[PDB]
Design an enzyme around this catalytic site. Structure first.
Site, short mmCIF file in Angstrom:
data_model
loop_
_atom_site.label_atom_id
_atom_site.label_comp_id
_atom_site.label_asym_id
_atom_site.label_seq_id
_atom_site.Cartn_x
_atom_site.Cartn_y
_atom_site.Cartn_z
N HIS A 119 0.80 -1.21 0.00
CA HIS A 119 0.00 0.00 0.00
C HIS A 119 0.84 1.27 0.00
O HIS A 119 0.28 2.37 -0.10
CB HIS A 119 -0.96 0.01 1.20
CG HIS A 119 -1.99 1.09 1.15
ND1 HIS A 119 -1.88 2.26 1.88
CD2 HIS A 119 -3.13 1.20 0.43
CE1 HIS A 119 -2.92 3.03 1.62
NE2 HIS A 119 -3.69 2.41 0.74
N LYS A 148 3.11 4.36 -1.23
CA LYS A 148 3.14 5.16 -2.45
C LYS A 148 4.35 6.09 -2.39
O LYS A 148 4.33 7.09 -1.66
CB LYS A 148 1.86 5.96 -2.62
CG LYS A 148 0.57 5.18 -2.44
CD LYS A 148 -0.10 5.52 -1.12
CE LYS A 148 -1.51 4.97 -1.06
NZ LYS A 148 -1.51 3.49 -1.04
N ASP A 200 16.23 9.79 -9.14
CA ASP A 200 17.69 9.84 -9.03
C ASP A 200 18.18 9.65 -7.59
O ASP A 200 19.30 10.05 -7.26
CB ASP A 200 18.25 11.15 -9.60
CG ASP A 200 18.18 11.22 -11.12
OD1 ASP A 200 17.93 10.17 -11.76
OD2 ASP A 200 18.37 12.32 -11.67
N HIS A 257 -8.70 10.39 2.61
CA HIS A 257 -7.79 9.25 2.46
C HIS A 257 -6.41 9.56 3.01
O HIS A 257 -5.53 8.70 2.97
CB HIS A 257 -7.72 8.84 0.98
CG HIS A 257 -6.99 7.55 0.73
ND1 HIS A 257 -5.62 7.44 0.80
CD2 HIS A 257 -7.44 6.32 0.40
CE1 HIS A 257 -5.26 6.20 0.52
NE2 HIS A 257 -6.35 5.50 0.28
N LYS A 273 -3.28 10.07 5.49
CA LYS A 273 -2.74 9.40 6.67
C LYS A 273 -1.80 10.41 7.31
O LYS A 273 -0.60 10.41 7.03
CB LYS A 273 -2.03 8.10 6.30
CG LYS A 273 -2.90 7.12 5.53
CD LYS A 273 -2.81 7.36 4.03
CE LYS A 273 -3.39 6.21 3.25
NZ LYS A 273 -4.71 5.80 3.76
N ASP A 287 1.63 19.56 18.34
CA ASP A 287 2.30 20.68 19.00
C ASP A 287 2.94 21.67 18.03
O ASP A 287 3.79 22.46 18.45
CB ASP A 287 3.37 20.17 19.97
CG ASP A 287 2.80 19.28 21.06
OD1 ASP A 287 1.56 19.17 21.16
OD2 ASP A 287 3.60 18.67 21.80
C1 LIG Z 1 -11.34 4.64 -2.60
C2 LIG Z 1 -10.45 3.43 -2.42
C3 LIG Z 1 -10.73 2.77 -1.06
N1 LIG Z 1 -9.99 1.53 -0.80
C4 LIG Z 1 -10.31 1.04 0.55
C5 LIG Z 1 -9.64 -0.30 0.82
C6 LIG Z 1 -8.13 -0.19 0.68
C7 LIG Z 1 -7.78 0.42 -0.68
C8 LIG Z 1 -8.54 1.72 -0.92
O1 LIG Z 1 -7.68 0.78 1.71
C9 LIG Z 1 -6.39 0.85 2.09
O2 LIG Z 1 -6.02 1.81 2.71
N2 LIG Z 1 -5.56 -0.17 1.79
C10 LIG Z 1 -5.90 -1.36 1.03
C11 LIG Z 1 -7.43 -1.53 0.94
C12 LIG Z 1 -8.03 -2.24 2.14
C13 LIG Z 1 -8.87 -3.33 1.97
C14 LIG Z 1 -9.44 -3.97 3.06
C15 LIG Z 1 -9.17 -3.54 4.34
C16 LIG Z 1 -8.34 -2.46 4.49
F1 LIG Z 1 -8.08 -2.03 5.74
C17 LIG Z 1 -7.77 -1.80 3.43
N3 LIG Z 1 -10.72 2.48 -3.50
C18 LIG Z 1 -9.98 2.43 -4.61
O3 LIG Z 1 -8.91 3.03 -4.71
C19 LIG Z 1 -10.57 1.69 -5.77
C20 LIG Z 1 -11.93 1.74 -6.03
C21 LIG Z 1 -12.48 1.05 -7.09
C22 LIG Z 1 -11.65 0.31 -7.89
F2 LIG Z 1 -12.18 -0.37 -8.94
C23 LIG Z 1 -10.30 0.22 -7.67
C24 LIG Z 1 -9.76 0.91 -6.60
#
Ligand SMILES: C[C@@H](CN1CCC2(CC1)OC(=O)NC[C@H]2c1cccc(F)c1)NC(=O)c1ccc(F)cc1
Length: 576
Positions: free
Chosen positions: A128, A130, A135, A398, A400, A405
């Site tokens: 997960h 990003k 370089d 979304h 994090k 402080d």
């Molecule tokens: C809007 C976002 C929300 N997701 C929430 C869930 C996850 C990934 C993002 O959330 C996380 O943070 N990590 C991995 C994932 C996860 C899964 C289960 C339990 C978790 F705790 C986390 N959806 C997308 O991007 C998306 C939507 C439609 C699509 F066709 C393709 C992509």
């Protein structure tokens, strides 16, 4: 054997920059990629090649992601992309397509996908993190993927029917809450996220994590077939993004043997969250996609929710004035009648208010109803006028993010859940930035020397959600003051939540406690449709996007009977 047990040391006096929303983040990553000379490292949970990093669409496809990579790969630049191999049942993600799509541009572009599809082993967790590294000198860390729907500005528009400008082209216009969506009948779901950038030796720290996983995945892939990819090497001891500041930067990560091939798993992100929370003197600002904590040693294990409640109790004991700020989406981001939504709403409410182990449960057990003076839970929501009809949609936070402080900031991709924090679960990466340059500020009415990085990020964060952006911004200078907390933050959050409930009759509501109550509530007349003139005039009183979080939404509904079956095989630890 570093601070927090991290793999990366504390790079003192490094260049760093914070980003609020993806528009500035996508723009700087595009300008940084275009001036690459040797390498570009990319790893994404989801990657969409045909998105524009510079909007409004400027010079054709010049700033489209696939064209940016294509242009630099033709100049001798070696680009390496590491994608997450989605589950076979995940219909929305097609990593095999983007893997071929990206590599068919130029041979200098090589992509690897993990987990391994051909492996006999079964992988529950994902990649997960990003990060984009250029370089090994400039690196971007945060919770923003190079994917559809991430790009957004600070107004968080719900409409995009221009030809005046069209910002979200094609599949970039999406709504992941509640069939290709109609741009002219349904609004889009805005994206509120936080990212950051680092330079110098801290960017080399981010690169070493990339190199370890790249070389590790190649070996694991070689257990089944030989690869025509090379091994990567860290650079040894030139470009700067405009607007960065000097501060103390340290890199954190959640890695294990299955993900990075490390002997002992790492949860430096988790330990830093607890440490920054424990050593906070005045306030904590939380902005997270998920709020799953308060450990019971059975299903939940991370210590963030326990740390927040125990820290407030110390403030109540020592007569200290303390303010916590928790910002989470009103609903999880899933397509109620769902399996992941009901589970994640349950464990979120379990952390927040439902239970004796919850935060407010630990608080009320000693200070009663006077938890209102310390902690506040909110969500984001906005409204708009589309095709002649008033519509509303929640803003998905979304990000994090953790701020403390006006000196300490943590930005990354790790949610507040066991999936992101335990380290042995999902693979995440974050950065902690402690400030060394001080700027005059106010805190608790007195004179405070606050850092430039953290106070600047909090100020920008406060302006967006509170509606003081491009405005005098006179009340929000002091975040702990009794005037700001009670009369600005909680007042704006409470007022907006009631206006939307009166105008739009939207969900989630703390007045709906059952699924049967849900069906009657929505088949009731809506004020926004039957009296648009009154609704438009009433909607003018909203300031910002901050609304109060409903505590009693589907309160009488239980998780086990709805999601459980007679003979279940899916562990519940997957949603925590
Ligand atoms: C809007 C976002 C929300 N997701 C929430 C869930 C996850 C990934 C993002 O959330 C996380 O943070 N990590 C991995 C994932 C996860 C899964 C289960 C339990 C978790 F705790 C986390 N959806 C997308 O991007 C998306 C939507 C439609 C699509 F066709 C393709 C992509």
């Amino acid at each position: 054997d570093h601070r927090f047990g991290s793999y990366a040391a504390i790079q003192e006096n490094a260049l760093a920059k914070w980003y609020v929303n993806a528009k500035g983040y996508f723009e700087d990553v595009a300008n940084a990629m275009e001036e690459a000379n040797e390498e570009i490292f990319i790893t994404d949970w989801w990657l969409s090649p045909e998105i524009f990093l510079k909007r409004p669409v400027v010079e054709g496809n010049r700033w489209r992601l696939d064209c940016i990579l294509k242009r630099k790969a033709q100049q001798g630049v070696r680009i390496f992309i590491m994608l997450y191999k989605e589950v076979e049942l995940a219909l929305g993600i097609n990593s095999e397509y983007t893997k071929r799509t990206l590599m068919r541009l130029h041979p200098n572009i090589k992509v690897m996908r993990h987990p391994d599809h051909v492996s006999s082993t079964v992988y529950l967790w994902a990649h997960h993190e990003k990060l984009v590294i250029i370089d090994q000198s400039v690196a971007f860390v945060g919770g923003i993927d190079l994917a559809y729907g991430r790009w957004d500005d600070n107004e968080h528009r719900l409409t995009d029917v221009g030809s005046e400008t069209r910002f979200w082209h094609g599949k970039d216009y999406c709504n992941f809450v509640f069939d290709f969506i109609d741009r002219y009948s349904t609004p889009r779901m805005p994206w509120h996220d936080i990212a950051s950038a680092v330079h110098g030796k801290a960017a080399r720290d981010v690169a070493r994590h990339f190199i370890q996983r790249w070389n590790f995945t190649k070996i694991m892939k070689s257990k089944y077939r030989s690869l025509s990819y090379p091994f990567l090497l860290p650079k040894s001891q030139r470009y700067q993004v405009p607007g960065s500041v000097h501060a103390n930067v340290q890199l954190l990560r959640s890695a294990a043997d299955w993900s990075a091939g490390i002997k002992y798993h790492e949860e430096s992100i988790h330990a830093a969250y607890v440490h920054v929370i424990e050593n906070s003197r005045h306030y904590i600002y939380i902005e997270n996609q998920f709020f799953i904590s308060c450990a019971d040693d059975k299903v939940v294990f991370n210590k963030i929710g326990d740390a927040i409640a125990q820290r407030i109790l110390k403030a109540h004991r020592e007569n200290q004035k303390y303010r916590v700020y928790v910002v989470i989406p009103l609903l999880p981001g899933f397509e109620g009648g769902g399996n992941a939504l009901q589970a994640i709403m349950h464990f979120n409410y379990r952390t927040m208010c439902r239970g004796e182990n919850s935060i407010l449960g630990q608080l009320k057990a000693e200070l009663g109803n006077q938890w209102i003076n310390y902690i506040s839970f909110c969500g984001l929501r906005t409204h708009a006028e589309l095709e002649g009809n008033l519509v509303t949609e929640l803003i998905y936070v979304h990000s994090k993010l953790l701020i403390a402080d006006d000196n300490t900031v943590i930005i990354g991709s790790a949610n507040i859940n066991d999936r992101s924090m335990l380290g042995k679960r999902d693979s995440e990466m974050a950065v902690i930035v402690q400030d060394t340059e001080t700027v005059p500020s106010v805190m608790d009415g007195k004179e405070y020397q606050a850092g430039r990085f953290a106070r600047g990020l909090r100020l920008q964060c406060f302006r967006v959600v509170l509606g003081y952006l491009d405005d005098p911004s006179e009340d929000i200078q002091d975040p702990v003051s009794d005037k700001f907390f009670k009369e600005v933050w909680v007042s704006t959050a409470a007022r907006n939540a009631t206006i939307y409930d009166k105008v739009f009759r939207c969900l989630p509501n703390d007045e709906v406690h059952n699924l049967i109550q849900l069906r009657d509530f929505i088949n009731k007349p809506v004020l926004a449709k039957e009296d648009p003139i009154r609704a438009e005039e009433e909607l003018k009183k909203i300031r910002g996007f901050l609304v109060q979080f409903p505590f009693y939404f589907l309160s009488e509904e239980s998780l086990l009977p709805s999601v459980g079956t007679k003979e279940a095989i899916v562990p519940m630890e997957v949603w925590t």
